Paper text:
To circumvent this, we used glutaraldehyde to crosslink the [name]-[name]-17b complex to stabilize it prior to small molecule addition. Ultimately, a 3.6-Å cryo-EM reconstruction revealed that [name] binds in the predicted pocket, and major interactions involve conserved Y586 and F522 and a rarely occurring (1.5% of sequences) F518 that is found in [name] [name]. The FP is reconfigured compared to the DDM-bound complex such that the side chain of F518 supplants the F522 side chain from the DDM-bound complex. F522 now becomes a secondary contact to [name] and is trapped between F518 and L537 (of FPPR). F518 forms a cluster of five aromatic rings (F518, F522, and Y586 of gp41; Y40 of gp120; and the methylbiphenyl group of [name]). Interestingly, the entire region is ordered in the [name]-bound structure and can be fully modeled. Furthermore, the region is also disordered in a published BG505 [name] trimer that had been crosslinked with glutaraldehyde (Schiffner et al., 2018). It is possible that increased local order is therefore a result of [name] binding. Although [name] causes a global destabilization of the trimer, it does induce a relatively homogeneous and stable association between the FP, FPPR, α7 HR1 helix, and C-C loop of gp41 and C1 gp120, with possible allosteric effects on gp120 C5 (by C1 stabilization). Further assays measured an average half maximal inhibitory concentration (IC50) of 1.6 μM for [name] against [name], although the small molecule was not able to neutralize other viruses in the 12-member global panel. [name] showed inhibitory activity specific to the parental virus of the docking model [name] [name].
[name] fusion is facilitated by the viral envelope glycoprotein ([name]), a trimer of non-covalently linked heterodimers (gp120 and gp41) (Harrison, 2015; Lee et al., 2016). Binding of the receptor [name] to gp120 triggers a series of conformational changes, including opening of the trimer, exposure of the co-receptor binding sites, and rearrangements of the gp41 helices (Blumenthal et al., 2012; Harrison, 2015; Ozorowski et al., 2017). The N-terminal region of gp41 forms the fusion peptide (FP), which becomes sequestered during the initial steps of receptor binding by moving toward the trimer interior (Ozorowski et al., 2017). Here, we identified a pocket in gp41 of our previous cryo-EM reconstruction of an early pre-fusion intermediate [name] ([name] bound and co-receptor mimic antibody bound) (Ozorowski et al., 2017) that is proximal to the FP and contains a bound detergent molecule used during cryo-EM grid preparation.
Author numbering:
A (entry chain B), D (entry chain K), E (entry chain E): 512 to 660
B (entry chain C): 1 to 96
C (entry chain A), F (entry chain D): 33 to 125, 197 to 306, 325 to 357, 361 to 392, 412 to 458, 467 to 504
Write the structure that this text describes.
């Protein structure tokens, strides 16, 4: 709704779609926006107008902005926290940790076409910490090796 | 199970407890799964059984996590077992 | 092949708790309890609701394990303690007894809604049929709830929402013969409770009558049975078992007065219930007793909408009550608070370099 | 004026300058700021002060912030939408699509020194969609090739 | 306190710590946040509630947001101004300008383990402009060389 | 090895100046000068202070070279010119003389605090012992200051803060026999100044008495000496030397009236000072003279807290005064405004490619 920020809200509508579809949908909207084909509309409050009724729009005016400002800070924060895995400044970060069939013995077509993100992140939830640890280790080894040349 | 023996013609107090030390919803039932007593938050209710009358609890101890069944004017015919329904701790006691 | 890829912007939620806040159409000039409370406790209502429907999302809801319920409980218990002050209050601490001044106050519940703090949103179940738990196949996201009028009552729930299409029977376990069954009606039944200004006699000043349509009551109860029979097809609504008077009789508070009503005429035109206004009240707020000031001279009445029932069955479904948290569950059953965890991972056909 | 955000406003004053000059101007201001030679001043409203006059500054206080918050979201959005052309996270993105003399048969010195951005984006406006399509294609081919090694 | 923004405030507590410790601390918090182990709490104002008392929270509500919005703009600005040294989009940017023993004749272990950032930036303050000039020059030469292939 | 690395997010501050703003608990309905000024000049106070303690940070403060002091001076001089308007004002411009209407006004100083503009923060010295300059070993960051009640006085500073544990002797150079020594007390001493409503006689209507406890004065002065002896162990508090009457006697303004008090009974129960209310005032605002309206008929009194002294020594430390900037230094001594410069550099064991 509100409270999540534009970054999340523009992606949230894909919650009921497959993983593959979500990636394609984001690509398409970006194309239309870059080309000047479609425009993004605002959903922000108009501000009080009448002094006697102003509490109605200054309370919600401020709360709406607080939600957006915090969403920006969270977005920008994560974009740099990801430097640990070598994924800073990115939406899609491909790395060198191989996928374990023990985490999930499925093909990529099965995962991307017959599942949604809501399901995928439940099937492998108990390996999340394992994988995250490995991502950090891989980044450390890459940095080690580059600095030896 | 916990077995409590009286003098037949008197009174017995059987107890259920919770580790929360809070007043929580609870019920007491006999072996035929018929309600005897229980609460509804702060309020005490009675079960529509042979023990609908002659029975009470201690509302003041509910916030200590203590939910007793007190049967008054006790008869030998009341010497059945009883089941606690406190959280999932379905403990059993017997009245003699 | 099959390398780990990290994705940011993954539309995945997890259930979460937070210090959820209230909003209402508070006034601050009419002296009434809810509007002199809500003016410092709650913010103005949301001027721009979003209702985002999340496609084909299916979400597992559980009205009996929800947290929004506890939060509503804390605000209402604060509201009552801060307004309908008893003359004498006895809390079982030996006991601890205090007394307070008893100005009488207007008391007319207003809808209050709960709103998500920044970073959170509320998922809502939009199914016409939903039994209170398990997957809901039509989910939308909102910031604020519909609004619940905090009526505190037993046996019959007044001024709540309707099920719209069918009477819905909701229970954590419909067969355990322990939990209260919440029956949400798809139609409201009017109840007109009056204490006329001619009751000036004393031992009278505490008597009142509630008038219920026979046609409406009979149709509603027949419809309830039709659903009860689906669950229990081999059996063919009775007197309460007994207990504290707030459970045994129907009870409510209007105009600041505490009414207790005999419902055996309903569960066995113009069906009349015998009602009495009482001063010694068992608190719903916790264990203890309280004395309230004697009745107001004049004519006091309220016309309420019966929107649901609390029924129980043993090992002939009887009216039940108490446990105010359950009345709020009957309205909060469709909502949960979630947070978004945008960082996720999946195998892909790529590698670095 | 306001309503555009700091990202645009700091660039907008170059609207009357040549393309070459605009690039140099941005470079210079960045140098002075990084070095601690110059400072950026604020142009934000002071907030109400007096309760009886507060409508004047809460309406405009909120509107000024709304403009800035939306400018931030647009900036950050475009910075990732550009991932399609392989230009995410950048102000200046050099790519491998060659310039067509048919789009504009001019030298780079003529374009950068004797023209402003206002003129340049009009002379080639009817090729904008062609070029954008090619930019996407080139990025797809680069990704295809890197992942074949 | 406030007025600096979340970017600074999350780093400011390290002002009394050594340089080495500060880097490690940032790494750890990022790990805990990426893994979903810890959560960031908000410190934002609740908004007025009561109309008659609203000046108290609309003045400070707006000022708190102004501070955060400006912090975001400064953060994003610097992240691109740094393109001059070839450090755009980064927190830690390693370059090819060698360290001069004349700027400071110390080892890296002495600097990172026995000093805080408050001390380090004072000991070499009179070389700051020299170094910054060299960083720009190095970036220019790198760009020159890459574009000759 | 040892290559330059650029780091962003470096927690390093530098001292800076800015258009610092005021906040106070202003009222706008009581007609009093500070609350009809602050209502347009200052914002509501900070509802959510942070007090971030910066670890083991050591910071060099200097109360005599601070800028916050000048900023407070500009607001107070504006406050007085905009309120306590003289009937006759003479500024040495030949001279330029103007006259103004003289309504009398209530005059009761309120605490006013200074707050950092966005992009800035204030560092505060939390040491119990701090002599006004040099490294402070316990530093926290705040947006707003404690709040200074802008009492304008000489010799004795009224209604300021206390040193809590010890009397602190602060001087730019304790041995140059030129600068004023600010003595901050760790305890307040009460002074009760009254002009009773029986002084209706005229040549009287301008006489008032200030009552000081002997026990409190003697203990305080003994404690001051104990510290003075650490600095000056070979010597064992005297009459002022003379000068403008605002320096020679103690002076203050309460109720809008300007009081001048004889302090020789203090510096040589119920010690009484002889006080007079005067109409011709030498301005502290700049060089010039001003006439104020004659005394109010009725009973005027103020009870104030002595929180510090201004003493001087020549080449027996005498009361001093004037230079209002110094009274404000005694409260602003612990604060400085800084900015953060997040971009820094250091050598590391890495290279590009
Ligand atoms: C479900 O919702 C419905 C609304 O849709 C609720 O129904 C309302 O209930 C309230 C409370 O009973 C009722 O309010 C009264 O309306 C009267 C209209 O004339 C008012 O006069 C009355 O105020 C008097 O009583 C108050 C205290 O009870 C006093 O505080 C107040 O000062 C007034 O008292 C003076 O005047 C009387 C009359 O002369 C005299 O007797 C007193 O001594 C004193 O001098 C209330 O405002 C609404 O009118 C009802 N609304 C409708 C449409 O019928 C219903 O209560 C909700 N259900 C539940 C369970 O909450
Ligand atoms: C240190 O702090 C303390 C507080 O902790 C300060 O002490 C306060 O000082 C003020 C100013 O002297 C004093 O205020 C007066 O209180 C009186 C209470 O009865 C009021 O009556 C009086 O108002 C009258 O005088 C005003 C002008 O002086 C008029 O503007 C006003 O209209 C009133 O005047 C009418 O009424 C009087 C009385 O009948 C009559 O004589 C007049 O002619 C006219 O008709 C002030 O409000 C506070 O009471 C003191 N507070 C305490 C707790 O004692 C102290 O001043 C500070 N120290 C320094 C140096 O600033
Ligand atoms: C999911 O629930 C929504 C909300 O009730 C349904 O959409 C509404 O449909 C009615 C007509 O019946 C319209 O008047 C409303 O304006 C619609 N609301 C919104 C937010 O779109 C929706 O049809 C339901 N979907 C399914 C599959 O059951
Ligand atoms: C640095 O100063 C702070 C602020 O006074 C000290 O922390 C306070 O300590 C008291 C107890 O003496 C508590 O009641 C306060 O709540 C604390 N305030 C804060 C903001 O934490 C701190 O102890 C001092 N540190 C040193 C080393 O002197
Ligand atoms: C405050 C704020 C910050 C950022 C955003 C934001 C908006 C859109 C995207 N777009 C995206 O994620 N895509 C997927 C990857 C792809 C395909 C090849 O590149 C491009 C499209 C990202 C962030 C919104 C608000
Ligand atoms: C919300 C917000 C976000 C970003 C900005 C912003 C400010 C300045 C620039 N600077 C720039 O575009 N330059 C041109 C390229 C160059 C020369 C080699 O690198 C450096 C200078 C970019 C974004 C402002 C506000
Ligand atoms: C508006 C706003 C914008 C950005 C931020 C922000 C928060 C945290 C970081 N994190 C960081 O600097 N780290 C150091 C380097 C490392 C170790 C290997 O990568 C990761 C951790 C950066 C920016 C906050 C607010
Ligand atoms: C999967 O986990 C096992 C340990 O259970 C390990 O031996 C194997 O190498 C792992 N495979 C991948 C791709 O990580
Ligand atoms: C529901 O109640 C029945 C009857 O007592 C019992 O057998 C069953 O295990 C209960 N199920 C749950 C989930 O509690
Ligand atoms: C209650 O009174 C209203 C008129 O005010 C009437 O329309 C309604 O039908 C009555 N309800 C009952 C149950 O009699
Ligand atoms: C209830 O019904 C009886 C029918 O005889 C009627 O006299 C009475 O006035 C009604 N009361 C109300 C409140 O409608
Ligand atoms: C209702 O009144 C009848 C008498 O007519 C009595 O037997 C019954 O117990 C009462 N019911 C309640 C719930 O008070
Ligand atoms: C049920 O209540 C109605 C009220 O009109 C009464 O006529 C009927 O006799 C009652 N039946 C029983 C079994 O109590
Ligand atoms: C309730 O059921 C009992 C049998 O258990 C019967 O005796 C009683 O009359 C019934 N009461 C009502 C109001 O239906
Ligand atoms: C029920 O009450 C209404 C007034 O509220 C009246 O018009 C109607 O005639 C009453 N019905 C009966 C059966 O008394
Ligand atoms: C009862 O429902 C009707 C709609 O059928 C509505 O007009 C009336 O206001 C409702 N009454 C209450 C108390 O909610
Ligand atoms: C320019 O467009 C023509 C088609 O009209 C095409 O054949 C030629 O290769 C293009 N040149 C470039 C540099 O794209
Ligand atoms: C250090 O500065 C001197 C000039 O004083 C220069 O000759 C030398 O090459 C510099 N060394 C480095 C690493 O920059
Ligand atoms: C402090 O005063 C003494 C005595 O006059 C003088 O010798 C010394 O140089 C002064 N120090 C400073 C820093 O002014
Ligand atoms: C001033 O008067 C107050 C009573 O209002 C008294 O407590 C205080 O001790 C007095 N101070 C002096 C110095 O006499
Ligand atoms: C000061 O002390 C003298 C002692 O004789 C007393 O008469 C007088 O009233 C006191 N004045 C005040 C303002 O307390
Ligand atoms: C105080 O009064 C005495 C006379 O008792 C006088 O000698 C002295 O100079 C006066 N002091 C001041 C500061 O006015
Ligand atoms: C100092 O003042 C006190 C006031 O009580 C007086 O008794 C004493 O004689 C004075 N001493 C000198 C040296 O003036
Ligand atoms: C101040 O000192 C002088 C000597 O320089 C002495 O004559 C005078 O009496 C002293 N006055 C007081 C009040 O101590
Ligand atoms: C000082 O004044 C107070 C009243 O303010 C009085 O009670 C006390 O007795 C006085 N002390 C002396 C020595 O006169
Ligand atoms: C003087 O200090 C006491 C605490 O010891 C305080 O209660 C009183 O209000 C203070 N008076 C003034 C004028 O600040």
């Amino acid at each position: 709704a509100v409270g999540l920020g534009a970054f999340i809200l523009g992606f949230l509508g894909a919650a009921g779609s497959t993983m593959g579809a979500a990636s394609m949908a984001l690509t398409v909207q970006a194309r239309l926006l870059l080309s000047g084909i479609v425009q993004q509309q605002n959903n922000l409050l108009r501000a009080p107008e009448a002094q006697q009724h102003m509490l109605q729009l200054t309370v919600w005016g401020i709360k709406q902005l607080q939600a957006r400002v915090l969403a920006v800070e969270r977005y920008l924060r994560d974009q740099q926290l990801l430097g640990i895995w070598g994924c800073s400044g990115k939406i899609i970060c491909c790395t060198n940790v191989p996928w374990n069939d023990s985490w999930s013995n499925k093909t990529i077509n099965e995962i991307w076409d017959n599942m949604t993100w809501m399901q995928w992140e439940k099937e492998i939830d108990n390996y999340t910490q394992h994988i995250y640890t490995l991502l950090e280790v891989s980044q450390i080894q890459q940095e080690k090796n580059e600095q030896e040349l | 199970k916990k077995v409590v023996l009286g003098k037949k013609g008197d009174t017995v107090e059987l107890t259920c407890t919770a580790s929360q030390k809070k007043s929580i919803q609870f019920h007491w039932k006999n072996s035929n799964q018929i309600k005897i007593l229980g609460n509804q938050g702060s309020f005490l209710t009675k079960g529509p059984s042979k023990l609908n009358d002659r029975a009470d609890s201690r509302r003041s101890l509910w916030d200590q996590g203590n939910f007793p069944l007190i049967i008054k004017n006790l008869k030998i015919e009341d010497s059945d077992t009883y089941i606690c329904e406190v959280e999932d701790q379905k403990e059993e006691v017997q009245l003699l | 092949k099959k390398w780990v890829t990290v994705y940011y912007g993954v539309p995945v939620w997890k259930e979460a708790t937070t210090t959820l806040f209230c909003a209402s159409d508070a006034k601050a000039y009419d002296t009434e309890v809810h509007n002199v409370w809500a003016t410092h406790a709650c913010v103005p209502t949301d001027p721009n609701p979003q209702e985002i429907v999340l496609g084909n999302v299916t979400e597992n809801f559980n009205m009996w394990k929800n947290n929004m319920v506890e939060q509503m409980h804390e605000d209402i218990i604060s509201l009552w303690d801060q307004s309908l002050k008893p003359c004498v209050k006895l809390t079982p601490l030996n006991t601890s007894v205090i007394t307070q001044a008893c100005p009488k106050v207007s008391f007319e519940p207003i809808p209050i809604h709960y709103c998500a703090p920044a970073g959170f949103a509320i998922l809502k179940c939009n199914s016409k049929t939903f039994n209170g738990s398990g997957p809901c196949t039509n989910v939308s996201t909102v910031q604020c709830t519909h609004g619940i009028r905090p009526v505190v009552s037993t046996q019959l729930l007044l001024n709540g929402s309707l099920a719209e299409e069918e009477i819905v029977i909701r229970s954590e376990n419909i067969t355990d013969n322990a939990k209260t069954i919440i029956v949400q009606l798809n139609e409201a039944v009017e109840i007109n409770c009056t204490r006329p200004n001619n009751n000036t006699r004393k031992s009278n000043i505490r008597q009142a009558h509630c008038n219920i349509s026979k046609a409406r009551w009979n149709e509603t109860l027949g419809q309830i049975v039709a659903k009860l029979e689906e669950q229990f097809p081999n059996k063919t609504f009775n007197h309460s078992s007994g207990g504290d008077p707030e459970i045994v009789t129907h009870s409510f508070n209007c105009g600041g007065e505490f009414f207790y009503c005999n419902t055996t005429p309903l569960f066995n035109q113009n069906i009349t219930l015998q009602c009495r206004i009482k001063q010694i009240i068992n608190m719903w707020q916790g264990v203890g007793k309280a004395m309230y000031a004697p009745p107001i001279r004049g004519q006091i009445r309220c016309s309420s909408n019966i929107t649901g029932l609390l029924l129980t069955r043993d090992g002939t479904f009887r009216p039940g009550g108490g446990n105010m948290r359950d009345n709020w569950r009957s309205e909060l059953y469709k909502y949960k608070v979630v947070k978004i965890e945008p960082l996720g991972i999946a195998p892909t056909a790529c590698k670095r370099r």
